[PDB]
Structure 1
């Protein structure tokens, strides 16, 4: 497999960053996930090469870390917290609003493939519970109407 040059360039950016190349795997994997909208399986053989690690090593990593997804491609990952505080403040109300607007449950992807809901543990924002992240952007859930408007920004 061959990476696009711009993406190749950044991956390689990350490898030169730390003293040892192998330390840049998570950063590189993040770039790949961010670019492709998921972690392609075919992308791994190439990356191990640049990492100067075995393919197995890289695949053990991808499986281990929950932020990387190798099965489903989504433009925008709606990370919805499911931990205690958020649950007390009203994760359910949030899930409901997401179902109504996007017509999908957690773990599911819209037919568009643009929005995927991912249930996650505490996002480090418990006072602003219920919490959700649209990709790198993080917001508090207030109401269905409010949610629509935010989601509207993700096209």
Structure 2
């Protein structure tokens, strides 16, 4: 397995950013997941080499951090807050609307690999509950009609 030069160049930039190469590990894994739509297991040995860390170290870091996904490729991750304030203000209404539009539940991917619903803890936007993200974009859920408009922008 080899990193495409465009991705490899970004990874080297992160590794060169901090005073110590190993400090770039999370920025590199974010970059890899951004590129592939998940962390390919095969990607970890080359990354370990670039960070000058043992593979078992890199594997343990991927396992520890909940944003990284080695299982499912998805173009867009719909992160739905399931914590106290979003639960009080209508997490279940948002999940119902997502099921009506996409036909999937939390933990599932659409058949085209486009959308994965990821249940997450408090996203720190609680005044705007119930909260969701679509990759890096973050939104208050108002209604199914409003959610349908937002999702139409992701192609």
TM above 0.5, yes or no, is yes
Question: How far apart in 1 are the matches of 2:13 and 2:33?
Answer: 16
Unpaired runs of 5+ in structure 1? none
Q: Deviation string for 1:69-89 (max 9, x for gaps)?
A: 000000000000000000000
2:124 counterpart residue number? 124
1:33 counterpart residue number? 33
> What is the deviation of 1:140?
0.3
2:133 counterpart residue number? 133
> What is the deviation of 1:130?
0.1
> What is the deviation of 1:136?
0.1
Question: How far apart in 1 are the matches of 2:34 and 2:7?
Answer: 10
Query: How many residues matched?
Result: 155
Q: Deviation string for 1:71-129 (max 9, x for gaps)?
A: 00000000000000000000000000000000000000000101000000000000000
Question: How far apart in 1 are the matches of 2:114 and 2:23?
Answer: 31
Question: How far apart in 1 are the matches of 2:88 and 2:112?
Answer: 32
SS of equivalent to 2:42? coil
> What is the deviation of 1:142?
0.2
Question: How far apart in 1 are the matches of 2:34 and 2:82?
Answer: 23
Question: How far apart in 2 are the matches of 1:75 and 1:140?
Answer: 21
SS of equivalent to 2:72? coil
Moved over 2 A (4+): none
SS of equivalent to 2:106? coil
> What is the deviation of 1:63?
0.1
Question: How far apart in 1 are the matches of 2:112 and 2:81?
Answer: 23
SS of equivalent to 2:138? strand
Question: How far apart in 2 are the matches of 1:111 and 1:55?
Answer: 32
Q: Deviation string for 1:51-81 (max 9, x for gaps)?
A: 0000000000000000000000000000000
Question: How far apart in 2 are the matches of 1:118 and 1:41?
Answer: 20
Question: How far apart in 2 are the matches of 1:26 and 1:114?
Answer: 24
TM-score (norm 2): 1.00
